[PDB]
């Protein structure tokens, strides 16, 4: 061969997988995710295809879901830091049934003029927020009394999800898998480089994925391993299913004095009949959606297998479907969607809630005045396998489930991978440097 | 008849084409790579350190200002016995870097310990006499 000599090159387009922090970006305008500090979005972002190069994607290793997990919780706690403690409101409640029982009409006597202007301030309380005192009437008190000090969320904080974007830092790039058939992992062929991702709204829910993206012209079902009962099945829907939710009760609210310079909002009277929360779901769209899902499930789980039975498994907040329409947390019985194996949902409202899990300090929602209405659609859902059974293709009871809230972002992040680019490299050449 | 793109390589695409063809856009790729508050502040400092690290080596090696510079270190064919054309017209940057990944520190050391050392010693001697 030729006498070869070392030549140094810079700008070499090669890279290695790496994990780092992506910068937030937002369509700039006390909403939790509406941080005062965030990069304005690019009105004309670029995307280029590699084509000579493929890349190994694995949605179960995208560490970006961890960044979102921690940052989102931090933002929640920060916005709701200067909020009102319920500590002096642990006073026992003399409760009777509210005439029309999920709502009790109770009284108490605290603080009784501890350098302030206060009184008994009777009010309405929800069953799901209190603990019975079986040694009394039965009487009630705040369920938090024997656990922790919790605060009433600041009335000035909105909880509307914001579609936050995330962009690569210098020296790093975001690769995207554009294969319509891409599942949990593999050598994605259609790979492109993206300057910055689209916005993902931090929607928090249990059992069904709401207001997300749609599948590429068919239902696509993903899992780490369809044979492993310890894994979950992620279903991305071809078209979404329409759901319309309402809180028909027109509620008032009252500010009460709890100390000098301190106020607390209580549920006031209710105007009109007291009715149940519920959501209306189109059976047509729901059933047709299931048809496509079943067809795909057959590919792995058998051609005559009975699927989709009633809700079961986990504590009440896992067994019920959960969402936060209007700022109030609704827990509805999804069984009405899965009450027939191979639509109006009854629903209750809770105010003392836990953002995915909370230790010690927790959030109590304020009462919302008026009526709550919203509209959304089911764009995905999580199925769980019921466990061991006869191998024969008889049953596989894909119950709704999933309590790991991180999957509400992983379900979108699966498209992306972050790498570190190494511009420095060498190769042989023909001649020696003309060294004197 | 030929269909054409606009101007030049978008970003990294050449990584899977031969190193010969890929060399055309080193100016593009280099420029693009070279160039809440606290987390970003940390990232900025890290970017600077990575930036300067590369500049340090390019300075020492006598390569500063160039994206292509010839050294005076001979190629030891033990690393790879491929000819010039067998590499440059037949192998990509991603593939090449892997082939000689385990010689990176070796060759980098040789550039500094042998050539740079020589160039600085002899330079002074030539300036003196």
């Amino acid at each position, epitope marked *: 061969a030729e006498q070869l000599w070392v030549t140094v090159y810079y700008g070499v387009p090669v890279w290695k997988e790496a994990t780092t922090t992506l910068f937030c970006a937002s369509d700039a305008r006390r909403n939790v995710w509406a941080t005062h500090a965030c990069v304005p979005t690019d009105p004309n972002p670029q995307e280029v295809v590699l*084509e000579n190069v493929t890349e190994n994607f694995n949605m179960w290793k995208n560490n970006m879901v961890e960044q979102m997990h921690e940052d989102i919780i931090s933002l929640w706690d920060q916005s709701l830091k200067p909020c009102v403690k319920l500590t002096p409101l642990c006073v026992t409640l003399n409760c009777t049934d509210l005439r029309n029982g999920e709502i009790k009409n109770c009284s108490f006597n605290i603080t009784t003029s501890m350098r302030d202007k206060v009184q008994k301030e009777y009010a309405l309380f929800y069953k799901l927020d209190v603990v019975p005192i079986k040694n009394d009437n039965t009487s009630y008190r705040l369920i938090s009394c024997n656990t922790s000090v919790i605060t009433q969320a600041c009335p000035k904080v909105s909880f509307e999800p914001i579609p936050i974007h995330y962009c690569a830092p210098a020296g790093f790039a975001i690769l995207k898998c554009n294969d319509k058939k891409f599942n949990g992992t593999g050598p994605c062929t259609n790979v492109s480089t993206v300057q910055c991702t689209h916005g993902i709204r931090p929607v928090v829910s249990t059992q069904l994925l709401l207001n997300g993206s749609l599948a590429e012209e068919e239902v696509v079902i993903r899992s780490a391993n369809f044979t492993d009962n310890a894994k979950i099945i992620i279903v991305q829907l071809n078209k979404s299913v329409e759901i319309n939710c309402t809180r028909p009760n027109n509620n008032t609210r009252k500010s009460i004095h709890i100390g000098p310079g301190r106020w607390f909002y209580t549920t006031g009277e209710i105007i009109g009949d007291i009715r149940q929360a519920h959501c209306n779901i189109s059976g047509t769209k729901w059933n047709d959606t299931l048809k496509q899902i079943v067809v795909k499930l057959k590919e792995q789980f058998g051609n005559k297998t009975i699927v989709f039975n009633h809700s079961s498994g986990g504590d009440p907040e896992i067994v019920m479907h959960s969402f936060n329409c209007g700022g109030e947390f609704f827990y509805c019985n999804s069984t009405q969607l899965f009450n027939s194996t191979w639509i109006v949902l009854p629903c209750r409202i809770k105010q003392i809630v836990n953002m995915w899990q909370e230790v010690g300090k927790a959030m109590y929602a304020p009462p919302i005045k008026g009526q709550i209405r919203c509209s959304s659609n089911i764009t995905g859902l999580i199925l769980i396998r019921d466990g061991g059974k006869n191998r024969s293709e008889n049953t596989e009871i894909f119950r709704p489930g999933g309590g790991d809230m991180r999957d509400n972002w992983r379900s979108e992040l699966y498209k992306y991978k972050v790498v570190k680019i190494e511009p420095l490299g060498i190769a042989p050449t023909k001649c020696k440097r003309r060294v004197v | 008849a030929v269909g054409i793109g606009a101007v030049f390589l978008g970003f990294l695409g050449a990584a899977g084409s031969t190193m010969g063809a890929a060399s055309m856009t080193l100016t593009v790729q280099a420029r693009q790579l070279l160039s809440w508050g606290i987390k970003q502040l940390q990232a900025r400092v890290l970017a600077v350190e990575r930036y300067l690290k590369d500049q340090q080596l390019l300075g020492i090696w006598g390569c500063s200002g160039k994206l292509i510079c010839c050294t005076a270190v001979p190629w030891n064919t033990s690393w790879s016995n491929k000819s010039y054309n067998q590499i440059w017209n037949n192998m990509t940057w991603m593939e090449w870097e892997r082939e000689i990944d385990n010689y990176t520190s070796l060759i980098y050391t040789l550039i500094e310990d042998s050539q740079n050392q020589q160039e600085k010693n002899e330079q002074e001697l030539l300036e003196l006499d």
Partner: antibody
Framework: QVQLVESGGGVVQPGGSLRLSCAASGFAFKDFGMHWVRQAPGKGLEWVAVIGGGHGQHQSYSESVKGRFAITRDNEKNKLYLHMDRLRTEDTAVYYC????????????????????????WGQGTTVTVSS | AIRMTQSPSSLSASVGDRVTITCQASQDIKKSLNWYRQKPGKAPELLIHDASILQTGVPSAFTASGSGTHFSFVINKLQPEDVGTYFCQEYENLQFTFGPGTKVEIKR
């Protein structure tokens, strides 16, 4: 061997639409650039459009079809598509899918370009009628 | 792409005769010319590419020549099997225009 399976045709009304799908195997569909041509009854062969290989980062349309037809491709299905929208009766023809002699995205001059030297592989097409 | 013209539109001979098709460009196309042959019920068959080179598998029964604006397709001997319409296509620019086509048939 090499075989193109060209279907999706039939009869539509003017103002309607369809999409043709030419499935192919026996060659690296994903790599070579492809053509669309059509022949109306009693006429010669009219060139319709071209799409490059790889992901198809370059196209050209005949002035007779530009703005009314779109070309795309799926490299995993190995199918070439023609989106036949807002059609007129003048669009009645047998449409063919074809492969260029090369069509590859060469890296030259710092940019990708597609070199075409004309169709050399094809099936027999399918009839699309637009009438009322 | 430059408009191609072919002549005569109707070309015939007895079996075994030497039959040629005239094809011209209104502007210099240098060499970018393919010759196709269509038979009833069959998509046009590529016989010659780059104005002179037979396609792989095509027998040496045909030739072609010319450059610039003046080209010709030559049928060394016209056999019944060679009856069809021959097309002069230009591919210099991304319009890949086809010429009118010349029908070649056996005299009767």
């Amino acid at each position: 061997q090499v075989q193109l399976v060209e279907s999706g045709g039939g009869v539509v009304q003017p103002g309607g639409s369809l999409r043709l799908s030419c499935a192919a195997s026996g060659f690296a569909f994903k790599d070579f650039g492809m053509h669309w041509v059509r022949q109306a009854p009693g006429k010669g062969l009219e060139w319709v459009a071209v799409i490059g290989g790889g992901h198809g980062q370059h196209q050209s349309y005949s002035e007779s079809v530009k703005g009314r037809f779109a070309i795309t491709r799926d490299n995993e299905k190995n199918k070439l598509y023609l989106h036949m929208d807002r059609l007129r009766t003048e669009d009645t023809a047998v449409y063919y899918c074809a492969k260029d002699r090369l069509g590859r995205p060469w890296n030259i001059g710092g940019r990708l370009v597609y070199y075409y030297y004309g169709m050399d592989v094809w099936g027999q097409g399918t009839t699309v009628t637009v009438s009322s | 792409a430059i408009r191609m013209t072919q002549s005569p539109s109707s070309l015939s001979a007895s079996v075994g005769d030497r039959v040629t098709i005239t094809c011209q460009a209104s502007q210099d196309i240098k060499k970018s010319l393919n010759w196709y042959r269509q038979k009833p019920g069959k998509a046009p068959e590529l016989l010659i590419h780059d104005a002179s080179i037979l396609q792989t598998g095509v027998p040496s029964a045909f030739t072609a020549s010319g450059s610039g604006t003046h080209f010709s397709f030559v049928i060394n001997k016209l056999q019944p099997e060679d009856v069809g319409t021959y097309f002069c296509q230009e591919y210099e620019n991304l319009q890949f225009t086809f010429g009118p086509g010349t029908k070649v048939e056996i005299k009767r």
